[PDB]
Amino acid sequence: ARVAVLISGTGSNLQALIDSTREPNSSAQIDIVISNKAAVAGLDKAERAGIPTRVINHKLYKNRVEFDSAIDLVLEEFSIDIVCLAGFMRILSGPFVQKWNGKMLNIHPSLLPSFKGSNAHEQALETGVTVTGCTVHFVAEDVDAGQIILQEAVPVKRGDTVATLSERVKLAEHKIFPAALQLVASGTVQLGENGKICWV
Amino acid sequence: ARVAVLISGTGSNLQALIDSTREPNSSAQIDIVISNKAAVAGLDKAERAGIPTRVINHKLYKNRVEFDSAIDLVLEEFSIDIVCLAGFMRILSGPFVQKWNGKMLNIHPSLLPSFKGSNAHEQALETGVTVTGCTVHFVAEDVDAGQIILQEAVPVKRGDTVATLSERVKLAEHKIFPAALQLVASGTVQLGENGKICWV
Ligand SMILES: Nc1nc2sc(CCCCc3ccc(C(=O)N[C@@H](CCC(=O)O)C(=O)O)s3)cc2c(=O)[nH]1
Ligand SMILES: Nc1nc2sc(CCCCc3ccc(C(=O)N[C@@H](CCC(=O)O)C(=O)O)s3)cc2c(=O)[nH]1
Ligand SMILES: NCC(=O)N[C@@H]1O[C@H](COP(=O)([O-])[O-])[C@@H](O)[C@H]1O
Ligand SMILES: NCC(=O)N[C@@H]1O[C@H](COP(=O)([O-])[O-])[C@@H](O)[C@H]1O
């Protein structure tokens, strides 16, 4: 399965995916890294790994559909089979999500359905949970509401901040994201016809 | 700390609390078990342990306030310090919750704030999470929205039903409920003046 990874920043999840897809038994290969923001560290990680990169400045487009259309063009150019959102911080339009239904994965730093949105750690700390975690899910049009592939719980420690909590959760992200991608790339897991997750 | 345990059924959480409060280092003692339903197994467990029991048939009262008033009478009779809701399946009125603010704990079979309400396992299975768990929290007037004391994650296995999931989650309930009660009974944890959880 040919994979695109979309990023918006540091790219630690990208790095974990790169590392896992170079294992001999990987069923996925990363053929392109796309960022909506220039000069982010994730682009350096891609380039160090010899992976092509494209920057698509969402700010330069009329609307979400035209921006996504530019992404879709690159995905078609590289004959992509699966899209991983790895720290990608832009909401995708409906028809783009529809097109890639069952082929696009996202990592989210909470145990969905808790704490949807862009500041999950902040919500988790404000709420006072002692257990949080991360989730890989299929992207459906409804944000952070697609079919869940894998999750891993992570403890919250007293005195945790976004900094320290996000560090602990990322160690879990870097395990379940590569594992989830392998499950989808190998055909072990798919979206079923009833739209829910099917273990083949 | 003198403890009342309120139940509505089988009483496995009650049994775990009984067992823990008989350890020499327990800071809690269970002085009364109250059920809103007759002939449930939790009443047999209490009686086998030599603990007084009272049945208060909510159906026999005019409204929630009068019913809670009957509970409160028993709590005062037994000079109770802390109330544990252990499978108690009745919503408590506002003034009763206010009175026992910071003194009443509840066990809920999900990782709050996910899956509030009476059918948490059903919701967890319908949603498709691969990680669920249980939560002990202080009871605030807003249902399943008081301050979280402890939580424990529990995996969901493929093919799980309410039966098999609830069995696995209960093993975790029987650990964190006794632990949470010990934290409150020993004064290690309280509701702070800002209303949030304070570790002393
Ligand atoms: N349809 C659909 N799309 C997506 S995308 C995705 C992965 C990331 C989700 C996390 C985010 C939540 C809110 C964000 C936001 O408000 N972003 C702004 C500003 C950013 C900028 O500076 O540009 C923007 O989008 O304008 S990002 C999941 C997902 C999905 O489930 N469904
Ligand atoms: N204010 C306040 N009260 C409470 S109680 C509690 C522990 C249990 C919560 C789980 C439940 C959710 C909904 C229930 C329900 O609909 N029960 C019906 C029918 C039962 C019957 O047959 O009688 C009834 O209450 O009439 S039970 C937590 C809690 C809290 O957080 N805040
Ligand atoms: N809702 C999306 C979201 O919050 N994504 C989060 O951004 C971080 C990206 O780190 P990275 O750039 O080092 O992979 C990750 O923690 C990811 O879960
Ligand atoms: N929202 C409350 C709720 O769902 N309570 C749940 O009822 C069960 C009682 O079992 P038990 O009678 O064997 O303790 C427990 O699983 C508890 O978490």
Tell me the C-alpha to C-alpha distance, in Å, between residue B23 and each of A118, A138, A164, B52, B170.
Answer: 45, 48, 36, 19, 21
N-terminal to C-terminal alpha carbon distance within chain A? 17
Question: Domain span at residue B17?
Answer: 1-200
Cis peptide preceding A113, ω within 30 of 0 = yes
Q: Least CA distance to A116: which residue of chain B? A: B114
Q: Do B199 and A158 touch (CB under 8 A)?
A: yes
d(Cα A15, Cα A30) in Å, to the nearest integer? 11
**What is the DSSP-derived secondary structure letter of residue A60?**
G
- Which residue in A32, A97, A105, A106 sits closest to A65, CA to CA? A97
Method of determination used here: X-ray
Identify the three-state secondary structure at position B146: coil
Entry resolution in angstroms?
A: 2.0
d(Cα A141, Cα A52) in Å, to the nearest integer? 28
- Which residue in B31, B107, B15 sits closest to B74, CA to CA? B31
- Residues A20, A26 contacting (CB under 8 angstroms): yes
Q: Report the number of distinct structural domains present in chain B.
A: 1
Taking CA atoms only, the protein residue closest to ligand 3 atom 13 is A12
Of B147, B152, B158, the CB nearest to A131: B152
Parallel, antiparallel, or unpaired for β A53-55 and A29-35?
parallel
Residues facing B134 on adjacent strands? B152
User: Helix B162-185 and helix B120-127: axis angle, to 10°?
Assistant: 120
**What is the DSSP-derived secondary structure letter of residue A93?**
P
Known binding residues of A: 11-13, 64, 89-92, 106, 140-144, 170-173
